[PDB]
Amino acid sequence: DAMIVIDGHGIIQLFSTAAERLFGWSELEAIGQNVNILMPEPDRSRHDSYISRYRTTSDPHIIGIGRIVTGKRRDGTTFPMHLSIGEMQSGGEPYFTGFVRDLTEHQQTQARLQEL
Numbered sequence: 463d464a465m466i467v468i469d470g471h472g473i474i475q476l477f478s479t480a481a482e483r484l485f486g487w488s489e490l491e492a493i494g495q496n497v498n499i500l501m502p503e504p505d506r507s508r509h510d511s512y513i514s515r516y517r518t519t520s521d522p523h524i525i526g527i528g529r530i531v532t533g534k535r536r537d538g539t540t541f542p543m544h545l546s547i548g549e550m551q552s553g554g555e556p557y558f559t560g561f562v563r564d565l566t567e568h569q570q571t572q573a574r575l576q577e578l
């Protein structure tokens with residue numbers, strides 16, 4: 463599914479091909495951008511504080527957990543997505559992998575079934 467890797471400051475390091483299809487950005491456009499560009503406010507401005515919180519305290523909240531959130535595409539449309547975060551280390555620095563699954567079709571079917 464969509465895979466994204468960031469360093470300890472939330473900057474995107476690797477951006478899969480599927481992530482390019484899901485979010486709109488090419489990998490070259492994405493690499494070097496903060497991860498907060500893939501999500502709407504209030505989370506967007508808050509995100510770096512979430513990572514900071516985790517880094518200074520070492521007490522996890524969603525690391526190793528899989529949850530549903532709203533992502534935000536290049537065109538600005540929002541969508542529900544299942545997010546799973548992995549923490550890794552390399553060259554002495556922490557990295558984080560996010561595996562995303564688009565749930566837009568699940569939300570649509572569900573709404574349609576409720577609508578009818």
Ligand code: HEM
Nearest residue numbers: 466500501505512513516522523524525531533558559560
């Ligand atoms: C694009 C949709 C995303 C949203 C809405 C989002 C939102 C959030 C929120 C709300 C928190 C704090 C959760 C809590 O304190 O309970 C958080 C933490 C964090 N997010 Fe994201 N995130 C997004 C994607 C990502 C991705 C793609 C990555 C990794 C590649 C990532 C990495 C992190 C990290 C490292 C933390 C700290 C975890 C912790 O506090 O245990 N986020 N995110």
